[PDB]
Design an enzyme around this catalytic site. Structure first.
Site, mmCIF file in Angstrom:
data_model
loop_
_atom_site.group_PDB
_atom_site.id
_atom_site.type_symbol
_atom_site.label_atom_id
_atom_site.label_comp_id
_atom_site.label_asym_id
_atom_site.label_seq_id
_atom_site.Cartn_x
_atom_site.Cartn_y
_atom_site.Cartn_z
ATOM 1 N N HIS A 80 0.843 -1.213 0.000
ATOM 2 C CA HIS A 80 0.000 0.000 0.000
ATOM 3 C C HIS A 80 0.860 1.238 0.000
ATOM 4 O O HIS A 80 0.874 1.986 0.981
ATOM 5 C CB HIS A 80 -0.959 0.011 1.165
ATOM 6 N N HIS A 84 1.470 1.563 -5.808
ATOM 7 C CA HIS A 84 0.040 1.193 -5.821
ATOM 8 C C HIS A 84 -0.812 2.425 -6.136
ATOM 9 O O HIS A 84 -1.674 2.382 -7.010
ATOM 10 C CB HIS A 84 -0.366 0.599 -4.477
ATOM 11 N N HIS A 118 -5.798 7.670 -2.378
ATOM 12 C CA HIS A 118 -6.717 6.838 -1.668
ATOM 13 C C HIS A 118 -6.134 5.959 -0.548
ATOM 14 O O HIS A 118 -6.911 5.488 0.292
ATOM 15 C CB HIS A 118 -7.530 5.991 -2.669
ATOM 16 N N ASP A 119 -4.810 5.727 -0.540
ATOM 17 C CA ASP A 119 -4.231 4.879 0.494
ATOM 18 C C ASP A 119 -3.207 5.677 1.280
ATOM 19 O O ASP A 119 -2.348 5.087 1.888
ATOM 20 C CB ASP A 119 -3.589 3.609 -0.091
ATOM 21 N N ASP A 229 -8.715 -0.004 -7.708
ATOM 22 C CA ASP A 229 -7.959 -0.469 -6.508
ATOM 23 C C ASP A 229 -7.450 -1.897 -6.704
ATOM 24 O O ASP A 229 -6.342 -2.246 -6.333
ATOM 25 C CB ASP A 229 -8.880 -0.409 -5.277
ATOM 26 N N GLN A 281 -6.534 -17.139 -3.392
ATOM 27 C CA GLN A 281 -6.683 -16.294 -4.581
ATOM 28 C C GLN A 281 -7.912 -16.680 -5.398
ATOM 29 O O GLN A 281 -8.647 -15.794 -5.840
ATOM 30 C CB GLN A 281 -5.432 -16.369 -5.428
HETATM 31 O O1 LIG Z 1 -8.920 -7.047 1.236
HETATM 32 N N1 LIG Z 1 -7.772 -6.926 0.838
HETATM 33 O O2 LIG Z 1 -7.036 -6.086 1.360
HETATM 34 C C1 LIG Z 1 -7.314 -7.719 -0.162
HETATM 35 C C2 LIG Z 1 -6.756 -7.168 -1.325
HETATM 36 C C3 LIG Z 1 -6.273 -7.967 -2.362
HETATM 37 C C4 LIG Z 1 -6.378 -9.351 -2.185
HETATM 38 N N2 LIG Z 1 -6.021 -10.389 -2.976
HETATM 39 N N3 LIG Z 1 -6.319 -11.545 -2.377
HETATM 40 C C5 LIG Z 1 -6.885 -11.289 -1.177
HETATM 41 C C6 LIG Z 1 -6.934 -9.906 -1.032
HETATM 42 C C7 LIG Z 1 -7.413 -9.105 0.002
HETATM 43 NI NI NI Z 2 -5.703 0.659 -2.446
HETATM 44 NI NI NI Z 3 -7.166 1.037 0.977
#
Ligand SMILES: O=[N+]([O-])c1ccc2[nH]ncc2c1
Ligand code: NI
Ligand code: NI
Length: 330
Positions: A80, A84, A118-119, A229, A281
């Protein structure tokens, strides 16, 4: 403690930057990966704002100060981070270019900025963590904890001297854009995504979806934010796979903290459970990414290449599960 500010050298350098000419063609495509061009990332953002919003939209010095201060308020965390931020802003650019006149000048400028911001000041810890252990942020922001903080950080940077890129908007338009930005950042809370997507799917399928209805517009913008995102899942497979490595580095560092506090982490955050990652995944693509891009494509047909790519990556995770994985570098 406090909001970081760029140096004079940093922003003046960005002012002089020119985007190598070969990249102009590539930056328009959904599949573009900013990965190999790190020195250029701020300049890439300038270019996108100028193409979408016009070279006159923001005073250049204020825009360059803003961008370089934003960069300095992303932390050196595995996922993050500044990379990103720019990746998510690029996806938004591609969506906006492909659907340009559906959105107002104020919405395009607000959404590109919202994506970059945003992050902001992400610490590498989830909302689940901050709330389980009563971090002060969870007391201040009872839901969408980090997202509320990212928006507060955005306002903080706008408020730095010489950084307010929105000051030339009328008093009304200024209020409106800050609200576009707030809603868009809050929408990046995946907790809100499930409800949003289900609502949009219903509106779309019954025919009630109406972009002249402000609440509908807010929801469509919300799903655009999710799509941007998560756009690592819409890149070419090797890019998607490397990005997943960074996401998990972050998750595992969090899981390590929960073990010290006497809680076993969810398996996803457990570095001793890497064998579960491929099925994890698969679950994420089935539950989140695929439905998101599916709905976005129904509402905004030009975004179809995002869905096609997400499906291709779903197929690759399935290949991993079947033991068909070939050579990977990390
Ligand atoms: O919620 N997340 O932060 C988040 C983001 C991307 C992700 N890829 N696989 C699980 C997962 C969870
Ligand atoms: Ni993000
Ligand atoms: Ni975020």
């Amino acid at each position: 403690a406090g909001t970081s500010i760029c140096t004079s050298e940093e922003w003046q350098g960005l002012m002089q930057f020119t985007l190598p000419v070969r990249l102009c063609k590539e930056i328009e495509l959904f599949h573009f990966d900013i990965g190999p061009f790190e020195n250029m990332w701020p300049g890439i953002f300038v270019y996108m704002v100028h193409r979408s919003c016009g070279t006159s939209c923001f005073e250049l010095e204020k825009l360059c100060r803003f961008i370089m201060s934003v960069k300095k308020n992303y932390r050196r965390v595995p996922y993050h981070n500044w990379k990103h931020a720019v990746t998510v802003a690029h996806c938004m650019y591609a969506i906006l270019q492909n659907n340009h006149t559906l959105f107002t000048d104020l919405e395009r400028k607000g959404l590109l900025i919202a994506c970059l911001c945003h992050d902001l000041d992400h610490r590498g810890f989830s909302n689940s963590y901050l709330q389980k252990f009563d971090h002060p942020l969870a007391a201040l922001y009872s839901t969408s904890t980090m997202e509320q903080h990212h928006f507060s950080q955005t306002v903080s940077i706008l408020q730095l001297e010489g950084h307010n890129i929105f000051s030339t908007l009328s008093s009304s338009e200024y209020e409106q854009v800050l609200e576009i930005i707030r809603k868009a950042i809050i929408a990046t809370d995946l907790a809100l995504y499930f409800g949003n997507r289900k609502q949009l799917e219903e509106m779309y399928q019954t025919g009630s979806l109406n972009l002249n209805n402000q609440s509908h517009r807010d929801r469509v913008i919300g799903l655009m934010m999710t799509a941007c995102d998560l756009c690592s899942v819409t890149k070419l497979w090797p890019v998607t796979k490397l990005t997943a490595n960074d996401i998990y580095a972050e998750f595992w560092a969090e899981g390590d903290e929960m073990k010290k506090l006497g809680i076993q982490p969810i398996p996803m955050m457990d570095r001793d459970k890497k064998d579960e990652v491929p099925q994890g995944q698969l679950g994420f693509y089935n539950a989140v990414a695929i439905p998101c891009y599916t709905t976005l494509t129904q509402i905004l047909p030009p975004t179809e290449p995002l869905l096609k790519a997400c499906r291709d990556n779903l197929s690759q995770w399935e290949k991993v599960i079947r033991g068909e994985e070939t050579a990977t570098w990390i």
